[PDB]
Amino acid sequence: CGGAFAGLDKVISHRVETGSGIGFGATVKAKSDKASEGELLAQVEPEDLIKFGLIPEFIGRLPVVATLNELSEEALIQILKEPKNALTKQYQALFNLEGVDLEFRDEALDAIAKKAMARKTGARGLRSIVEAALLDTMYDLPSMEDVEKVVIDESVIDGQSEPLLIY
Amino acid sequence: CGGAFAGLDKVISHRVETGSGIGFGATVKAKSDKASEGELLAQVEPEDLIKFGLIPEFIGRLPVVATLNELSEEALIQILKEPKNALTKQYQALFNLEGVDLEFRDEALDAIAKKAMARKTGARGLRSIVEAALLDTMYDLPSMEDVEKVVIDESVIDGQSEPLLIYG
Amino acid sequence: LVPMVIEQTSRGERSFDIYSRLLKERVIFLTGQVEDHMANLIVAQMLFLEAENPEKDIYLYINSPGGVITAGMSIYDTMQFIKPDVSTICMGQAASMGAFLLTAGAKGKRFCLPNSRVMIHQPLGGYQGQATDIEIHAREILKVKGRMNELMALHTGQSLEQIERDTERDRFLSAPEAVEYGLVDSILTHRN
Amino acid sequence: LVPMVIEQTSRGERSFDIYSRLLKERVIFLTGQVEDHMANLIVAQMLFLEAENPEKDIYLYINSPGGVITAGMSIYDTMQFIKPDVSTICMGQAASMGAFLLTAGAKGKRFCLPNSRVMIHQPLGGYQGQATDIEIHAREILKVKGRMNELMALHTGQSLEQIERDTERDRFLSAPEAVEYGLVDSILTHRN
Amino acid sequence: LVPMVIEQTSRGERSFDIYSRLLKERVIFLTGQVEDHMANLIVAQMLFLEAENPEKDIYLYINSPGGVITAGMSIYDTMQFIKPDVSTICMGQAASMGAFLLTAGAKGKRFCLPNSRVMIHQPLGGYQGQATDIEIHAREILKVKGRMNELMALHTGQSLEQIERDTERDRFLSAPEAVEYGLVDSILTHRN
Amino acid sequence: LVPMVIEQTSRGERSFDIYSRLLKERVIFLTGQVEDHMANLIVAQMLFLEAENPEKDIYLYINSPGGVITAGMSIYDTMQFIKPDVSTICMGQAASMGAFLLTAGAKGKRFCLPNSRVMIHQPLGGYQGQATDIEIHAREILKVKGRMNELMALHTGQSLEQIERDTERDRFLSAPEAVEYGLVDSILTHRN
Amino acid sequence: LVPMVIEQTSRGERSFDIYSRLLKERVIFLTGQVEDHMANLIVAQMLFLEAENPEKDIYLYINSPGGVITAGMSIYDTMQFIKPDVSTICMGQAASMGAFLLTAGAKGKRFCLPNSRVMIHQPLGGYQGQATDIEIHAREILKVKGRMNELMALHTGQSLEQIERDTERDRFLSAPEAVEYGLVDSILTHRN
Amino acid sequence: LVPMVIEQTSRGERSFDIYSRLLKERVIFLTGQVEDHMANLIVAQMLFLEAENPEKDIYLYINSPGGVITAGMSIYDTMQFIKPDVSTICMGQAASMGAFLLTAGAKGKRFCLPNSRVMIHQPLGGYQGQATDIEIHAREILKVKGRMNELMALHTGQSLEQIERDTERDRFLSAPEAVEYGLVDSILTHRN
Amino acid sequence: LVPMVIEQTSRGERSFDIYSRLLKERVIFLTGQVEDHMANLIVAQMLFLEAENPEKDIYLYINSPGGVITAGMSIYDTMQFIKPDVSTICMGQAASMGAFLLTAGAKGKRFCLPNSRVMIHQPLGGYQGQATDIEIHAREILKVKGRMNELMALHTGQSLEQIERDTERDRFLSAPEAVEYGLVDSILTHRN
């Protein structure tokens, strides 16, 4: 069983990150400097899930627990180059049938990562940034002839310039 | 018929505490005399179940009632040694096919009992304490060679140290 | 106007007034003159905390220029009746009746701020009517003065003769002098 | 301002005022002067508790300097009419009418705080007009004075002659003297 | 302040004020002076109960020193117009207008507390202006006095001549005398 | 204070004030003196009922000692403008302006309680200043007096000459006389 | 007190005050004296309706004895600035400033009730101080009087000379005369 | 009373007061006299909008006869400190302090209604006591007058000598004259 | 009136008052005279923020003409007791007690607006009675004056002799002079 738990971190944070009263005599615990979503879920426990709404019996059937660290900016760049299922490799093969080469420089990938985190959509909504830029290029690619390479610079992402085509 | 009735302790407490105690005369023991869940189930009766939702006609067909106590630190240690189907013996056989021995010292069992009671899950919440500790060890155990015995110390459960490995 | 705060809980978000939020942590505020309405309100707060937990210390912050005596004695008897230790703190000023509830707190859990000020004097009164009635009201207020001095000595530890001489007229006591006088236990200068 | 509290129940969380929370536990507060509005409010509280449970004791805390007589007699007749035993406690002060409702509580369930004070005197009145009208209002207030002394003797157990002499002028009674006088049963010094 | 109560119902939990809870049980409170605003509020309550159930008895508790005459007559005509029997109870005091609404209740469902008191007198008024205008307002108030005595005799059963002599000046009537006078039917000493 | 009621509906339970509940049934209350604020509130109520249903009769209960004329004329024009028949009832009293709105109701749907009273007089005013300004305000109030008598005759059916003589000074009219005078149609003694 | 109404909508049931319900239909109420607070409230209402719909006519009902001039001119400039046609209606009375906002409505969408009354006069003021300061405040109020007459002529269509003679002293205008004077367009006698 | 409005949103329906709705659109109202409480309320509104969005223009509508100087200067310094351009509009009137905050707005985003009026004079004060203390308070108010003239010249563009002569006594400036004087940028006659 | 705002959060929409919204960001407002009620309210805000986060800076905006001394000293001791650095800002004016809390802020986090003004003088008091009592109250106020000068030197860095001479009479200090005097650290002219 797996799934995202919205609002859970708040429940765990309130329980784990506090040992203080509001009065004069009660000591004040200094904690929770950073959100630490990845490091906070690691400190989860079954009792924390009971407050969320799960039943203790259901949790007993699932003793093992796994905490998935969130995505980072540099992590997105690795996702587009190392795995075979990277979108860069998908579009690269999309143009391979047409006898045309494709390129993706680091100057464009690092800029795309900033767009994604700004959108708060994650890696799933990363295609919208790519396809939005290669729309006009793809639209007039079949009719174009004698073209062997296409380069996408950082300016192309902003939209000021157009991708450089080599004949 | 058998099922863990959740929330049955709250209804029984009203019948046995007998008072809110916001007044001058009424006595107030919030935590000193707080009812124990184990003892409380012993004092159950059919009228208590009607408030829970059961029908009297249904309870009349089941006159006998059996109340079970919660696990204790001492009881958890015996569960890992006396029963043949204990989790300790399970992992012992898991590595026997691999040609490796397994051991569990008493110092580690006492620490596991305290961690399990805090989870409020019972015997079923014990595998989380074991598999979470031996995750790293199991992940790289097959690749290792000439390893014939493994020892798990109390520190291993705490996470400060790693489980000592023996070489044949 | 009273500011509203949000208490983040596992069940959900709840909106509370600033005075109610502190009440959840066994904290009561004594502000302004001590009257029958304000005194009867604090009594209900103490009783509510008694039922919730009889083993946790209660904190009473006092900033008041005093007021009616009969309204204040209802609070004093309540603090002694209930089991929890009622911690007292003096903020700004503590007049005759405000000082009596301050010293009446649990021994060892009484504090005064470094710049706080305590004032003590004798009971005030008056009457207009026949001479027979003036003698009655005079005997009654005399008993209160004697009764208030007896209890003041019990918590402060001083002798009854000393309290009688010091309470003949207004007497201001700084925060350091209150410790030496047995009225309080220590001063909460900084948070350690 | 009135602080708000949370009553944790199985159904869910509910927000209550401090006065409403105690009302749920058969506790009523009598504060300030006794008037037609304040008196008519307490009567509705007693009736509401009677229907909810007629076998549980009600607790009435009184801290009042007295007031109108007719407003107070409505409460006395109500306490005697209903079946539940209305326990009375004196906090701070109990004047002429506050004392009458105090002693009117159920026998054996009347208490007075260690520092409480009770005061009793005769009814007050006045009129301006023709001599024929003054005689009428004088006969009426005389009947009330006689009627108030008869009931005081019934609950206190003293003789009617003794109440007449003691109520001619203001008479203050300390907490110990009230027990000896039959006005109350005991004192709630500490919680045992 | 008005305390809040919880009415446990099958649909769910609901929070009600003490006055609104009793209204659900066909109970209305008449407190303080009778004026145009307070009188117009009670009339709406009676009509609301008539539509909900025309066969259940209504209970009207009266504790008032009287007031405007025109404001009170609107209530009297309403009680007689509607079909349900308006039961009346006297708590504390019942002045000239409070007594007229008390006796106007349904026969056999009128009660007076053991210590209640009723007072009756003639209408009060006054005017300043020309002699021609004084004669007009004098004739009008004279008709009301005659009209109020005629209706008083109808419900009390006494003769018009007796009411005229007894209402010439203020006349106080204790609870036992009211039964003998036909104003009420019995006394609710205890709950049987 | 206003009591709260529960209107049981198929959708669910809803809480309403006593005045708002009657508004749902096309009932408006006119209480106290007629002023610009109270008058402007009733106009919004009439318009709201017009939109909800233009074919259902409206009931207007009036209990008022009168007030400003200009505030009352805004209500009169509204009742005549809208299509629904505005039924009027007099409870307690109906002064000069209250009587004009009473008789202005729809013919055949005007009632007066058995003990109600109506009073009519001439408009009241005054001014302080130069003689030229007094003449202007005098001519204006004279037109209103003439205009108010013309409309009174239109609904009452009497002649303009008769209204002028009867309105020269204060004139009180009992409930039976109002029927004979054409001011109302019948009396709602009992519910048949 | 303000009655609450229920607006049946597809989403669900919602409770609204009588004044807020009419605001939803582009209706604003101008009641009482015109001041800085009451004037600033109506301006916010007009802007809110402009954003919701800039092509629907707005209706402004005026019942006011007038007030401050500067407070009223803020409303006049707002009505002319916004695109929607602000329809004006006179209920009860329209004084100097109330008449200026009445005539300032959109041409062809101005109405007056059959019994309404309009009054116009010159600006009022005063000052106490040195002669140099009196001359300054006198010149300022003179400009306003000239400015108020210029705008009155623009909407009424009359000449500036006529407005000067008619506004020298108080001048009352009946509903028929207002139409003949160009102040309004028609009269809303009945609903057709 | 404040009317309630409904803001239709995709998530659902929400109820807002008329003043709070405009606050959502970066609009603040300055009504009545400028005091410490009213001034401190506007400051919190500006800061709240700064955190939500520091790049959107704020609109401040001013209709005030002026007041305390120190209360007004807190708003002026706040407008200059925050990054957003505070647009100012004059509705009805703008006195000495209201005029200073008007011209202190962002250049090019200052407007005045066609019939608005601005007034400027020197600071007012007074003191009673020893001659030594009068000299101190006199030197202080002189610095403020000099400081207020320096800033007025900075935003209006006029010379410091001109502001000193024009502010010696009360000076009224019409809407056209304010543009020529550099106090404002344009006039919002109609909506284009 | 206080405008309401909506704080957009992931869980949902919540409605907050303008003062409570800023409180969430560790911002407290000190407006008007310093009294026992207003001072006790600010103390609860500081304690609430301490528990929520003890490492985040608190911001205190002060606009006050001063007031009671005992009420102000409760705030000063609290700011020094808690661990967080209480940043202070002067808006409009800062009198004797307002200036003491201003300089009492954390070193390096004290600011004054470009047009703000600070005023300092000696404590004010008075008494009426016997000569023996005047000597007691005179010695007490002398200690406060000495104590207030000692602390002023500690935070301002000046010598005790200089503060005594400068505080003998009222002394106004402009914003630039306050920096040179050690009272503040810098000026928040613009946002960088």
Numbering used by the authors:
A (entry chain E): 247 to 413
B (entry chain D): 247 to 414
C (entry chain L), D (entry chain K), E (entry chain J), F (entry chain I), G (entry chain H), H (entry chain N), ...: 2 to 193
What does the literature reporting this entry say, word for word?
In the ClpXP protease, for example, AAA+ ClpX ring hexamers bind target proteins, unfold them, and translocate the unfolded polypeptide through an axial channel and into the peptidase chamber of ClpP, which consists of two heptameric rings (Wang et al., 1997; Grimaud et al., 1998; Ortega et al., 2000; Ortega et al., 2002; Sauer and Baker, 2011). ClpX subunits consist of a family specific N-terminal domain, which is dispensable for degradation of ssrA-tagged proteins, and large and small AAA+ domains, which contain sequence motifs that mediate ATP binding and hydrolysis, ClpP binding, and substrate recognition (Baker and Sauer, 2012). We describe here near atomic-resolution single-particle cryo-EM structures of single-chain ClpX pseudohexamers bound to ClpP and protein substrates. These structures show how asymmetric hexameric rings of ClpX dock with symmetric heptameric rings of ClpP and reveal how the pore-1, pore-2 and RKH loops of ClpX function in substrate binding.
We calculated a D7 symmetric map for ClpP and parts of ClpX∆N making symmetric contacts, four different classes of symmetry-free ClpX∆N maps, and then extended each asymmetric ClpX∆N map to include one heptameric ClpP ring. The hexamer in the class-2 structure was generally similar (pair-wise Cα RMSDs 2.6 Å) but differed in the position of the 'seam', a dilated inter-subunit interface that occurs as a result of ring closure. All ClpX∆N maps contained substrate density within the axial channel, which we generally modeled as an extended poly-alanine chain, although additional side-chain density of the substrate was modeled as arginine (residue 5) in the class-1 structure and histidine (residue 3) in the class-3 structure. The class-1 and class-3 structures also had density corresponding to a roughly globular native domain above the channel. For example, substrate was contacted by the pore-1 loops of subunits B/C/D/E in all classes, by the pore-1 loop of subunit A in class 4, and by the pore-1 loops of subunit F in classes 1 and 2. When contacting the globular portion of substrate above the pore, the RKH loops mimicked adjustable structural jacks supporting a house during foundation repair. In the symmetry-free maps, the unoccupied pocket in each ClpP heptamer was always located between the pockets bound by IGF loops from ClpX subunits E and F.
